[PDB]
Symmetry: none
Subunit: 223 residues, 2 copies
């Protein structure tokens, strides 16, 4: 149904709440915790999660990384982390494509923001997730790591003009208002002047309501 968002060794309770808020922003409620450094349940995660309180109470905690992964058929490690590699890598745009092709049992790992995924924890994954970032800075908050893969997953990738008789009357009313004030000179330039003024007004391809707004603007300006 929805990928598990497995957080590996969370350290701040505040960081757990931000990622849960990022998950519910794009429709994910499957939060899984693996040995949070302060332990679970935590109350510090509450306010940081904003209205995603349900994702926290529905969280499933596991003693080990392997127990969190036991349900899933496929494992993704988001090592946006100083490792490694020896396993195939794909961008969050590429990972979300295959997961929608896959059936079924996806689980995605995120390491701690301070230290990142540990050697044994990365080994469980069949694929590495990495966020393209410029090396000049190249480091994210863990909630920023979760929101991006959650956003690519949610993407799925699964008026009018004019009518002509009013667009004609509007261009003709403006032209007669300009023609009364001597706008169309010199005579050789007149066809060129009307072309730019027409191209000025046919370019927008504005709606019927916008044409009435134009006619009421000219009606007062002509008065």
């Amino acid at each position: 149904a929805v990928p598990a968002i497995i957080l590996v060794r969370p350290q701040l309770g505040e960081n757990i709440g931000k990622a849960a808020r990022a998950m519910l922003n794009f429709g994910l409620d499957d939060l899984r915790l693996v040995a949070p450094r302060d332990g679970w349940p935590n109350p510090s995660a509450g306010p940081a999660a904003s209205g995603a309180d349900r994702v926290l109470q529905q969280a499933r905690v596991f003693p080990t990384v392997a127990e969190a992964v036991a349900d899933c058929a496929h494992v993704y490690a988001t090592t946006v982390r100083k490792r490694g590699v020896t396993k195939p890598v794909m961008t969050p745009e590429q990972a979300a494509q295959t997961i929608h092709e896959q059936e079924g049992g996806v689980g995605i790992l995120f390491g701690p923001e301070r230290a990142g995924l540990e050697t044994d924890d990365v080994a469980l994954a069949r694929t590495i997730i990495t966020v393209p970032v410029n090396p000049e800075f190249s480091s994210l908050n863990l909630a920023q790591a979760v929101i991006l893969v959650a956003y690519e997953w949610s993407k799925g990738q699964t008026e009018p003009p004019a009518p002509q008789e009013e667009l004609e009357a509007m261009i003709g009313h403006l032209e007669n208002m300009l023609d009364k004030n001597g706008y169309f000179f010199p005579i050789p330039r007149i066809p060129t002047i009307k072309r730019t003024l027409r191209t000025l007004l046919t370019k927008p391809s504005w709606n019927s309501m916008e044409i009435r707004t134009l006619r009421g603007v000219l009606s007062t300006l002509e008065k």
Copy 2:
């Protein structure tokens, strides 16, 4: 060049630095702040940016959204919900594609966290960016919206461009000054949406400097 990230009336300085950290993560460095609620500069934005100090050092503050965007031929309004004004809408992936093709200066607006942009601020933009958040929990963190738009923009993928907003604002003000004399703004309760419908249909055409220049000469001729 690169698109400008324009923060309209941010409330937390912690969000102001968190977004500049999101900007530098994905190649952005042009922060602009429209009257920050706690003011500028503040230390509290400092640590939240972590190492993205360069953006806050280069950040510049403007009294008005139009002054923050005066150099931008194209203006985008980021939203998390259906907005009342009628503007073209595109996903951040779609907006990032046109922003790559577009020239003359792009500036994206971002509203205060939870509250979002004012309706007047959305009208100033030519195009809307709806982040496809869940409608029942459509409340992104301000920096979280900045990182999604910057993330899609980072994914790399004649020609006369639109006039800068300072030219479009001048032609709009030249028209409103002309219209104020003739009583055009007169159902008084309706005035704020009268200016809003007028600003939208003049920002819709996306016509260039010479076309705005031709429009100004048509107006001065109508004045006479």
